[PDB]
Structure 1
Amino acid sequence: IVTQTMKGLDIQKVAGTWYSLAMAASDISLLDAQSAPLRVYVEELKPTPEGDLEILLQKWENGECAQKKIIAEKTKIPAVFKIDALNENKVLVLDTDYKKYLLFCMENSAEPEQSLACQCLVRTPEVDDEALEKFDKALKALPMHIRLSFNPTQLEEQCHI
């Protein structure tokens, strides 16, 4: 569904700390409540020397913020990864300048119209306007119905408060 992957991606260079400044999905219910299925908060990106990609994130399960460790496997496409879930879920890196921001989407390899969720990640607990500008543009051609944004204070708390 998304055809804006980034060219020449050097995955190793996205390593470390990241903040989920904004997020969006194709369905309200995906980012609805705090426990919504795709309501995840990224903590750090850990690319293996082997080329795969470890994801450290926070998810609000139960009555608390749970720390999750997910592994997204590399594919023949340097910007696309596959996380081993009950189904085949692809992770796509649309663009990144390595130092300030990174845009990625999570797509379900199903139909009629699979679920889609994208995020605007930034390196610092600051509201980066340009990154959000780019995030908006990239979203223009996508079927989103819910879009969320967080403030600096929320970014420093777990599960964004």
Structure 2
Amino acid sequence: LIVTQTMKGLDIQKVAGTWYSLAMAASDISLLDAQSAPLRVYVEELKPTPEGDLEILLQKWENGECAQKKIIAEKTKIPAVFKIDALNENKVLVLDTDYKKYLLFCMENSAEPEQSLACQCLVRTPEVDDEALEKFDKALKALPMHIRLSFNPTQLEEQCHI
């Protein structure tokens, strides 16, 4: 069992725009292990829709190349929980954000979180934000992460982080 506590009172409209994947953590090493790993994904943009769904623009390394993926995340009765069907995942969970600097979120397959859970620390600007990383560490304290990666500004500004 992995238990998640998402942000109460998330206004999805105020997350719109460019983000950078500053850090990642996964329950299973193999999810992130290599450059090719199935959940090694780099957020470019969050685009909320008026009716409160969420488009996720990400980059992923598959066919020798650093390729674009669009994920449609459909809203649920919980503003911080969205339904997806991509990367073999079916849930997006928004743990926390201050809207103007950082956003923490997880994807998982609800059918098996321990082989599935991947969480990221996003920032709006391509700079290491030590506040953001500490919030990510605290949000991860009660999650059973087995791989954790943090990127430097050089890796931030890059195609699939170099």
TM-score clears 0.5: yes
1:142 and 1:115, CA in 2 relative to 1: closer, same or farther beyond 3 A? Answer: same
Change (3 A) 1:86 1:36: closer
TM-fit CA distance, 1:2? 3.5
**What's the CA shift string for 1:36-79, capped at 9, x where partnerless?**
00000000001111210000010001211001111111001111
- Shift of the 132–88 alpha-carbon distance from structure 1 to 2, 3 Å rule, reads closer
Q: How far 1:157 sits from its partner (Å)?
A: 1.0
Task: Measure, in 2, the Cα distance between the counterparts of 1:113 and 1:155.
Answer: 28
Q: 1:18 to 1:142 in 2, by over 3 A?
A: same
Q: What are the ranges of 5 or more consecutive residues in structure 2 without an aligned counterpart?
A: none
Report the counterpart of residue 74 of structure 2 in structure 1.
73
Moved more, 103-112 or 114-123: 103-112
SS of equivalent residue, structure 1 residue 158: coil
CA shift, 1:113, in A, is 3.6
Conservation of the 8 A alpha-carbon contact between 2:61 and 2:67:
yes
TM-score, length-scaled by structure 2: 0.95
RMSD: 1.4
- 5+ long unaligned stretches in structure 1: none
1:110-160 deviation digits (Å, cap 9, x = unpaired): 138442100000011110001100100111100100001111011111101
Question: Structure 1 residues 24 and 50 mapped into 2: Cα distance closer, same or farther (>3 Å)?
Answer: same
Q: In structure 2, what is the Cα distance between the partners aligned to 1:121 and 1:129?
A: 12
Q: Which stretch shifts more, 15-24 or 111-120?
A: 111-120
Percentage identity across paired residues of the two chains: 100
Instruction: Please list the CA deviations of residues 66-110 of structure 1 after superposition, one character each: whole Å capped at 9, or x if unmatched.
Output: 011111110011110010248661100010000000000111111
Aligned-residue offset at 1:35: 1.0
In 2: Cα distance, 1:82 partner to 1:112 partner: 15
Inter-partner Cα distance in structure 1 for 2:87 and 2:107: 15
**Cα offsets for 1:4-55 (capped at 9, x unmatched):** 2001100000000001000000011000111100000000001111210000
User: Which one is further off, 5-14 or 78-87?
Assistant: 78-87
Given that residues 39 and 87 in structure 2 are in contact (C-alpha distance below 8 angstroms), is that contact kept between their aligned partners in structure 1?
no
Larger deviation: 106-115 or 77-86? 106-115
